[PDB]
Amino acid sequence: EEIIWESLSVDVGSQGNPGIVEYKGVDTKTGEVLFEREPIPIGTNNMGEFLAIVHGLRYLKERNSRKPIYSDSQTAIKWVKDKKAKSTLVRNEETALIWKLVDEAEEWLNTHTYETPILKWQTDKWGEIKADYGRA
RNA sequence: ACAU
DNA sequence: CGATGT
Ligand SMILES: [Cl-]
Ligand SMILES: [Cl-]
Ligand SMILES: [Cl-]
Ligand SMILES: [Mg+2]
Ligand SMILES: [Mg+2]
Ligand SMILES: [Rb+]
Ligand SMILES: [Rb+]
Ligand SMILES: [Rb+]
Ligand SMILES: [Rb+]
Ligand SMILES: [Rb+]
Ligand SMILES: [Rb+]
Secondary structure (H helix, E strand, O other), rough: OOOOOEEEEEEEEEEEEEEEEEEEEEEOOOOOOEEEEEEEEEOOHHHHHHHHHHHHHHHHHHOOOOOEEOOHHHHHHHHHHHOOOOOOOOOOHHHHHHHHHHHHHHHHHHHHHOOOOOOEEOOOHHHHOOOOOOOO
């Protein structure tokens, strides 16, 4: 119903899907950019949305913050819940980097604990997520 | 259908 | 119009 303003919002951005993938996290209240991943030459939207949430988890844990995370990715929310990124992207030489980061993200999920709520950003009611890359 |  | 995913 209402936006939890005391929160972190994340989102992927891409050039092509599959294509060049990046992501970032912002303070929901102010839009301040809190982290940004350097672009990855080939990945999918869902892999980047997944990496963005996991990075958010690590970021908040390191800072002893109990803020929730907003994501507008139904897929990535489920993947993080499952601790398993069910991407269809081919594993080959040119996708090695994104797949390494996804594999390492799952590994982190499987070796650490967190209570961070991971919440659906309700775009239909609230407009676009504040971490969005005005590209779509 | 939904995330879009 | 094309894509990745449930
Ligand atoms: Cl990452
Ligand atoms: Cl919450
Ligand atoms: Cl969801
Ligand atoms: Mg998104
Ligand atoms: Mg977006
Ligand atoms: Rb900590
Ligand atoms: Rb966008
Ligand atoms: Rb957009
Ligand atoms: Rb669509
Ligand atoms: Rb969206
Ligand atoms: Rb579809």
